[PDB]
Amino acid sequence: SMEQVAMELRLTELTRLLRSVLDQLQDKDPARIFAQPVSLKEVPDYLDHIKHPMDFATMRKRLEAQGYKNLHEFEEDFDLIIDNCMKYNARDTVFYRAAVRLRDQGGVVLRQARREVDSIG
Ligand code: NA
Numbered sequence: 001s002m003e004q005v006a007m008e009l010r011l012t013e014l015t016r017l018l019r020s021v022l023d024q025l026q027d028k029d030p031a032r033i034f035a036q037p038v039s040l041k042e043v044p045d046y047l048d049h050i051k052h053p054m055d056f057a058t059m060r061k062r063l064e065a066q067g068y069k070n071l072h073e074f075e076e077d078f079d080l081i082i083d084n085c086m087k088y089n090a091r092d093t094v095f096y097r098a099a100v101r102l103r104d105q106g107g108v109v110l111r112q113a114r115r116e117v118d119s120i121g
Helices: 002-026 057-063 069-089 094-121
Strands: none
Touching: 002 057, 002 069, 002 094, 057 069, 069 094
8 A cells, every 4th residue: 555655654764864863872882882782602691680682783783674663662772772781880880981971972862863753753
């Protein structure tokens, strides 16, 4: 049907906006601390601590599979990256600190993306 295509055209444009959002968020992690999943070979106990791991490459594969229905789902994944890090790592570490900064710097970008999504559809 013609409805399904118009929907697919919107999902596609939502994917195009979320791609740009993802690039802007990832630019706020120049150290690439959140680039890739936490290594289970290197932190073998990680899953005893963190039940839902997340990272920017894993978000990217979901993004390109058009697996984000809306901005809320996308934000959930971003928040996981931050919240996981802040639990596993103590306050006085470079990792915890990198998350706090990513959160603060990401808020501006997510603020405007919420307006652009409401505004465009
Ligand atoms: Na902790």
